[PDB]
Amino acid sequence: YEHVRRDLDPNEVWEIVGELGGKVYKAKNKETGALAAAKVIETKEELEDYIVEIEILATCDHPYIVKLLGAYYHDGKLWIMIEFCPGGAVDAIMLELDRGLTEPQIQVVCRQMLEALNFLHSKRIIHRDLKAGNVLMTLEGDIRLADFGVSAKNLKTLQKPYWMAPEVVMCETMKDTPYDYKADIWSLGITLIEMAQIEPPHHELNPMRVLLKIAKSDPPTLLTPSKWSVEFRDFLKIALDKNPETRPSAAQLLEHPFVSSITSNKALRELVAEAKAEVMEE
Ligand SMILES: Cc1nc(Nc2ncc(C(=O)Nc3c(C)cccc3Cl)s2)cc(N2CCN(CCO)CC2)n1
Numbered sequence: 001y002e003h004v005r006r007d008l009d010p011n012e013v014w015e016i017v018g019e020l021g022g023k024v025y026k027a028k029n030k031e032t033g034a035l036a037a038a039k040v041i042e043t044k045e046e047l048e049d050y051i052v053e054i055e056i057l058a059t060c061d062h063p064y065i066v067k068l069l070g071a072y073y074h075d076g077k078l079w080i081m082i083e084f085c086p087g088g089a090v091d092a093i094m095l096e097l098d099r100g101l102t103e104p105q106i107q108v109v110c111r112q113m114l115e116a117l118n119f120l121h122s123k124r125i126i127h128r129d130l131k132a133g134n135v136l137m138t139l140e141g142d143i144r145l146a147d148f149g150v151s152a153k154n155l156k157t158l159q160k161p162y163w164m165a166p167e168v169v170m171c172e173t174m175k176d177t178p179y180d181y182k183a184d185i186w187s188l189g190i191t192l193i194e195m196a197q198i199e200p201p202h203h204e205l206n207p208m209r210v211l212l213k214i215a216k217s218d219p220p221t222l223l224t225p226s227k228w229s230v231e232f233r234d235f236l237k238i239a240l241d242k243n244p245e246t247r248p249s250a251a252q253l254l255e256h257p258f259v260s261s262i263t264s265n266k267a268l269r270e271l272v273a274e275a276k277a278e279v280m281e282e
Pocket residue numbers: 020021024037038039066080082083084085086087088089136146147148279
């Protein structure tokens with residue numbers, strides 16, 4: 001049975017039961033009871049973007065990656081059903097609690113993010129859009145990497161020399177292994193800083209000026225380094241290496257002392273508990 005289901009009717013198994021919010025609908029599974037975040041997109045030429053996105057998710061069965069629960073194309077509308085992550089995105093949590101994550105909370109996220117990235121890169125899949133907004137939480141206090149839109153669009157492009165300039169050679173070399181997957185390692189680093197300080201580095205600047213600033217400036221560091229362990233700072237130092245040639249893998253970073261001793265998700269379970277209690281304040 002293929003990954004996009006033509007034969008079955010989505011309404012048979014799934015029923016919409018609210019909104020989250022182009023749109024994002026909450027959907028109940030009538031057989032199992034399981035909850036899902038649903039997307040019912042009407043398009044019918046470039047829905048192959050979504051099909052490749054679905055085939056990425058289906059291949060990436062991992063604890064720390066969002067689960068594909070089902071994909072159906074049924075008279076004009078494409079249904080993508082993804083496991084419901086009741087904690088929401090980490091950036092939303094920071095907004096609700098009006099603060100950044102603590103270090104033990106960041107250590108868990110980092111550790112679990114590295115396990116997911118080590119897995120994705122094993123499959124020659126690159127996320128290419130890591131940020132706190134794409135790290136979703138469960139109530140047990142585990143992450144789920146979400147939103148493989150950018151990953152899929154990039155993959156579709158790749159799916160479908162004596163005179164070449166050096167800059168062009170470098171940008172076709174950065175498109176293949178073992179350089180392409182290093183982009184996620186840099187983005188992890190920035191995501192960690194975002195979790196420490198709520199906003200990412202260069203947030204004062206507008207997006208056009210930001211690209212130059214990332215190109216021209218030295219790697220970002222933590223604003224108030226006294227608040228953080230030398231292990232966190234050292235982790236950032238090596239992860240935010242501007243040269244992708246010397247920038248370490250996820251596999252290598254899993255052995256760094258900032259994450260190697262992490263054995264419990266407790267700090268994150270607490271975070272999600274605090275955030276959910278905060279939502280109840282009214
Ligand atoms: C926006 C949102 N999503 C939540 N969970 C998700 N699980 C999985 C998601 C996902 O895979 N989405 C997705 C899809 C489906 C397609 C393409 C691309 C993407 Cl990114 S989204 C929870 C949530 N909550 C409401 C608000 N808070 C409670 C009261 O305040 C917290 C809970 N809100």
